[PDB]
Design an enzyme around this catalytic site. Sequence first.
Site, PDB file in Angstrom:
ATOM      1  N   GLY A 111     -28.532 -14.579 -24.366  1.00 39.72           N
ATOM      2  CA  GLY A 111     -28.034 -15.188 -23.289  1.00 39.72           C
ATOM      3  C   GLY A 111     -26.401 -15.571 -23.506  1.00 39.72           C
TER       4      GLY A 111
ATOM      5  N   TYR B 176     -11.258 -13.626 -43.398  1.00 39.78           N
ATOM      6  CA  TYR B 176     -12.056 -12.573 -43.557  1.00 39.78           C
ATOM      7  C   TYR B 176     -13.391 -12.866 -44.080  1.00 39.78           C
ATOM      8  CZ  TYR B 176     -12.315  -7.613 -43.538  1.00 39.78           C
ATOM      9  OH  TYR B 176     -12.394  -6.097 -43.209  1.00 39.78           O
TER      10      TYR B 176
ATOM     11  N   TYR C 259     -11.691  -2.315 -44.666  1.00 39.89           N
ATOM     12  CA  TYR C 259     -12.612  -1.441 -43.324  1.00 39.89           C
ATOM     13  C   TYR C 259     -12.440   0.136 -43.898  1.00 39.89           C
ATOM     14  CZ  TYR C 259     -11.915  -4.494 -39.592  1.00 39.89           C
ATOM     15  OH  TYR C 259     -11.946  -5.691 -38.798  1.00 39.89           O
TER      16      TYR C 259
ATOM     17  N   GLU D 221     -27.926  -5.972 -32.930  1.00 38.46           N
ATOM     18  CA  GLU D 221     -28.462  -4.715 -33.963  1.00 38.46           C
ATOM     19  C   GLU D 221     -28.142  -5.344 -35.477  1.00 38.46           C
ATOM     20  OE1 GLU D 221     -27.167  -1.486 -31.795  1.00 38.46           O
ATOM     21  OE2 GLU D 221     -28.599  -2.057 -30.185  1.00 38.46           O
TER      22      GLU D 221
ATOM     23  N   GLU E 238     -11.749 -10.695 -36.474  1.00 38.47           N
ATOM     24  CA  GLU E 238     -10.597 -10.018 -35.743  1.00 38.47           C
ATOM     25  C   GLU E 238     -10.217 -10.746 -34.288  1.00 38.47           C
ATOM     26  OE1 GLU E 238      -8.533  -8.297 -37.525  1.00 38.47           O
ATOM     27  OE2 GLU E 238      -9.699  -6.966 -38.920  1.00 38.47           O
TER      28      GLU E 238
ATOM     29  N   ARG F 172      -8.448 -13.941 -35.331  1.00 37.92           N
ATOM     30  CA  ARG F 172      -6.990 -13.438 -35.420  1.00 37.92           C
ATOM     31  C   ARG F 172      -6.281 -13.036 -34.370  1.00 37.92           C
ATOM     32  NH1 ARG F 172      -7.958  -9.337 -40.529  1.00 37.92           N
ATOM     33  NH2 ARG F 172      -8.413 -11.031 -42.133  1.00 37.92           N
TER      34      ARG F 172
ATOM     35  N   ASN G  68     -21.015  -6.444 -19.412  1.00 38.16           N
ATOM     36  CA  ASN G  68     -22.427  -5.821 -20.196  1.00 38.16           C
ATOM     37  C   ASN G  68     -22.103  -4.518 -20.643  1.00 38.16           C
ATOM     38  OD1 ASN G  68     -25.147  -6.140 -21.000  1.00 38.16           O
ATOM     39  ND2 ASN G  68     -25.957  -5.195 -18.986  1.00 38.16           N
TER      40      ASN G  68
HETATM   41 ZN   LIG Z   1     -31.475 -11.947 -23.137  1.00 36.60          ZN
END
Ligand SMILES: [Zn+2]
Length: 257
Positions: free
Chosen positions: A11, A76, A119, A142, A173, A176, A191
């Site tokens: 949400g 970091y 990175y 994820e 980032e 920052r 979205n």
């Molecule tokens: Zn949801």
Amino acid sequence: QYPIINFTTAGATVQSYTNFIRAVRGRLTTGADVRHEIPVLPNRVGLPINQRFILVELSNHAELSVTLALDVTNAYVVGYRAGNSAYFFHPDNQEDAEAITHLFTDVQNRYTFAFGGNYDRLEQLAGNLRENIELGNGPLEEAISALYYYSTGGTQLPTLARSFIICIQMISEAARFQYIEGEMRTRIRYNRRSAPDPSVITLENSWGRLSTAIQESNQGAFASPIQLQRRNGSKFSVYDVSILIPIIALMVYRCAP
Ligand SMILES: [Zn+2]
Ligand SMILES: Cc1cccc(C)c1-c1ccc(C(=O)O)s1
Ligand SMILES: [Zn+2]
């Protein structure tokens, strides 16, 4: 105990993400040290170990939680906790190695990766560049699940590496750079899940050089120019702090005021 800031992908709104990044910035620095109207992170020299880190607890729709540890001196990510396991990036030196022993001290299982959290290393392990890794609420959801399931062998190392790139960009980032905070706000508003454009990647790459250029500036004018990129990948040089005041929110401490 280190301060904890909570964020959930379940949400998530422009408002909840705004409050999150402002709370992170508020715990990273007091804002007492300002150079040319840009705040400086605390000097590592004089920083007590009980003030060295902040914790960001991330939750998703699956009510899985992971806690990232951020170094207040450079914002970091140095490691994370998922239930009874904590994982840390390879520290750069002995002082940093000893510092991370103060994180997650009650956790049953502690692991330090042999590899660093930069990175270049994480892109190599992931097998993908930042320009090909999607950012947004879906990717963060994820990433949280991938980090959670590493300790039970459910996540392979490349997936963990990719999840770190997502978390680092959307938290560190964004803290920052107001500019990168705005890129993540837009993705939430619409979205959207999408890879960062060259403007974002080049700002990320240039953060340490910009902190130095601003702090070493002659009343705001850079000793030497810094080359950045526009959204379309076109290159331009910055000569002055003033153009960056809407772009950069935090700098690493380089020298005394
Ligand atoms: Zn949801
Ligand atoms: C105005 C500025 C100063 C320093 C660094 C950057 C990335 C920028 C840009 C803001 C919008 C840009 C665009 O639309 O291409 S570029
Ligand atoms: Zn100035």
